[PDB]
């Protein structure tokens, strides 16, 4: 049996304020529903999920969480944005789908602090935020999704990005290139071309082919289209080159979103 709780009131919710959603340790958080009003998702900046003071996932703005859910075609409702720790799209290969989905839940056992920090923009009309938690029996943080942010200059022609962090033992579920002039992209590991120079139209077709929604000004490289976790990139310690070849038509600054995965460690990634 699951428990649906109305989380404690969020302290000091005001424009230009730096608030935090401190989660009580002991149980497992499958989903966290954040209700907002008097403020836009884009006005909720620097969203950081921290476990024991360490960063787990980061969102430039709350709007990126809305887009994250939209991509998987999850239920979207105005005035509310959810933190899906449990991945509903997961499919089991040697275990049940339910086990593969729940495995991403945010367990808090052994933790000292679990927080969701963020800053409220100064322009916020009259910010009002509350949270509801869909919890289950306590478990260690264990297997978690680690959303990381990266910024890189994209040229008009060809750009290559090979300096992406490769935490050992971790995996990569997907890579999102946020740019308006990306025509095609190619992904390779150690010379091996796992993703040919696929045109945007072709890449976006495959994405939609798997029930995903294409995000505006984004080139998504989904390594878990089938929902199988073992299709994602396994960051082996021996990998010598993890490269991305981007064919752009514009000279701009791209925000590269990398969805990492791995067993949470107090002194790990």
């Amino acid at each position: 049996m699951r428990s649906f709780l109305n989380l404690n009131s969020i302290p000091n919710v005001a424009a230009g304020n730096s608030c935090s959603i401190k989660l009580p340790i002991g149980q497992t958080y499958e989903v966290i529903d954040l209700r907002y009003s008097g403020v836009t998702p884009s006005q909720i900046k620097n969203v950081r999920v921290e476990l024991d003071g360490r960063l787990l996932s980061t969102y430039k703005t709350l709007n990126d969480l809305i887009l994250e859910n939209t991509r998987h075609k999850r239920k979207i409702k105005a005035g509310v944005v959810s933190f899906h720790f449990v991945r509903p799209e997961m499919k089991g290969v040697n275990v049940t789908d339910l086990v593969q989905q729940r495995m991403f839940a945010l367990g808090t056992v052994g933790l000292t602090t679990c927080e969701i920090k963020f800053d409220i923009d100064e322009a916020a009309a009259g910010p009002k935020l509350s949270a509801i938690a869909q919890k289950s029996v306590g478990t260690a943080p264990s297997w978690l999704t680690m959303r990381r942010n990266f910024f890189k200059q994209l040229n008009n022609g060809t750009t290559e990005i090979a300096d992406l962090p490769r935490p050992v033992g971790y995996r990569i579920a997907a890579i999102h290139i946020k740019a308006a002039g990306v025509d095609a992209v190619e992904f390779q590991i150690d010379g091996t071309k796992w993703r040919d120079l696929l045109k945007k139209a072709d890449n976006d077709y495959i994405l939609e082919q798997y029930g995903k929604a294409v995000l505006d000004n984004t080139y998504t490289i989904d390594f878990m289209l089938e929902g199988d976790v073992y299709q994602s990139v396994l960051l082996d310690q021996m990998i010598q080159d993890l490269r991305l070849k981007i064919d752009s038509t514009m000279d701009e600054q791209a925000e590269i979103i990398v969805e990492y995965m791995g067993v949470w460690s107090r002194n790990g990634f």
């Binding site: 401190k22 149980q27 002194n267």
Partner: protein, 63 residues
């Protein structure tokens, strides 16, 4: 023995008894901090500690 008297006293008490014994302890802990800073393992230990509010817990059910 205490006594009251005006004028600059010829001899004064130049004793810093219990305060120096403490002050040495502060000097000792400074060397412990420096011992950590001299190695890379000392910096990584301090990275684990944050400064936040107190944490609560709650649980029920039969596993």
């Amino acid at each position: 023995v205490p006594t009251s008297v005006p004028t600059n006293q010829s001899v004064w008490g130049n004793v810093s008894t219990g305060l120096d014994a403490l002050i040495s302890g502060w000097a000792r802990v400074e060397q412990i901090k420096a011992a950590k800073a001299s190695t890379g393992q000392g910096r990584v230990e301090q990275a684990m500690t944050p400064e936040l509010d107190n944490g609560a817990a709650v649980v029920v059910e039969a596993p």
